[PDB]
Amino acid sequence: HHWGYGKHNGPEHWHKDFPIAKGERQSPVDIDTHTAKYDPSLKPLSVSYDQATSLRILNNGHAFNVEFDDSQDKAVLKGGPLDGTYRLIQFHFHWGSLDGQGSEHTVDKKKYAAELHLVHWNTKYGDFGKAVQQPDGLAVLGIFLKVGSAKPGLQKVVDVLDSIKTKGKSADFTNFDPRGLLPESLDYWTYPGSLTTPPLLECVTWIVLKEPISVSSEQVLKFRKLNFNGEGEPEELMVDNWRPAQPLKNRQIKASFK
Ligand SMILES: [O][B]1([O])O[C][C]C2=[C][C]=[C][C]=C21
Ligand SMILES: [Zn+2]
């Protein structure tokens, strides 16, 4: 009886195995755009993905992860609210059964169809597993998806999904350029939070871009054909793999923009 996104094992249950689910810096949150304060001291973000080395795509039973070579400083996030250098390890998405839900963060209570998470770890801690035990261990770039025009840079991801339908399947996924998933503007909100999946560790500096990317209905329909189950098991479509907004508690969301 492992955690998941069903009636019996979904987010409202996670606190039993992971009591930090009720902690003081949980994610995601609602971003109240009127209360977020412009912080003139932040920087422009530095997203340096030219030398990114994608390796593989994995259906882990909760999402699919596009994994990178993080054995050296190839694709890194720096600047913005961050001190030091954060190495890209993987990206994945959260999405809904219909276009009116799917994102984890919300903006004035608006839910987007999906949300992309580019996960990076602080190189001062040497490895990902050490990083997640630190309050400044991870930096996650969050990007909302809305349904409209196709995203050209997403189609290579869409077209491999048939090959990783079920939990535990992987495929080679070399030479994928994550720059093709970014919006034009890097304007962002930032706040201290957590992983949005068990173990829900409070180790993340969240950087949530204001500008959504557009994907087509056909693209997100292919996400929804994935399975949470393993091969041969009763089919459970991989949809609604999002955690709802958690209490903000004693946190301030800062804006990079006026
Ligand atoms: O799956 B997760 O919660 O979704 C948010 C992003 C993140 C970051 C590190 C590990 C897992 C996850
Ligand atoms: Zn995520």
CATH number at residue 181: 3.10.200.10
CB atoms within 10 A of CB 164: 21
Distance, in Å, from the CA atom of 67 to the CA atom of 97, rounded to the nearest integer, reads 25
Angle at alpha carbon of residue 127, lines to 125 and 128, rounded to 5° = 100
What is the amino acid identity at position 257? F
Total domains, the chain:
1
C-beta of residue 154 within 8 angstroms of C-beta of residue 91: no
Q: Does 8 participate in catalysis according to the annotation?
A: no
SS3 96: coil
Q: What is the DSSP letter of 149?
A: S
> How would DSSP label each residue in 56-95?
EEEE-SSSEEEEE--SSSSSEEEETT--S-EEEEEEEEEE
Structure tokens that stand for 114 in this block: 């999906």
Residue count of the chain: 258
SS3 107: strand
CB atoms within 10 A of CB 33: 13
Structure tokens that stand for 177 in this block: 């350029």
Residue 203's alpha-carbon distances to 106, 125, 139, 186, 235, in angstroms, are 20, 12, 8, 22, 34
With a 6 Å cutoff on the Cβ, whether 105 touches ligand 1 is: no
SS3 157: helix
Distance, in Å, from the CA atom of 225 to the CA atom of 70, rounded to the nearest integer, reads 29
Atom of ligand 1 nearest to the CA of 204: 8
Residue 63 has φ and ψ, to the nearest 5°, of: -165, -175
Residue 174's domain comprises 2-258
Scanning the chain, the segments in alpha helix (DSSP H) are: 128-131, 155-160, 217-223
**From atom 12 of ligand 1, which residue's Cα is the shortest distance away?**
195
Helix (H) or strand (E) holding 76: strand 76-79
Q: In angstroms, what is the span from residue 101 Cα to ligand 1's centroid?
A: 18
Closest to 118 in 3D by CA, of 199, 23, 45: 45
Distance, in Å, from the CA atom of 54 to the CA atom of 256, rounded to the nearest integer, reads 29
C-beta of residue 76 within 8 angstroms of C-beta of residue 120: yes
Quick one: resolution in A? 1.3
Is there a binding annotation on residue 197? yes
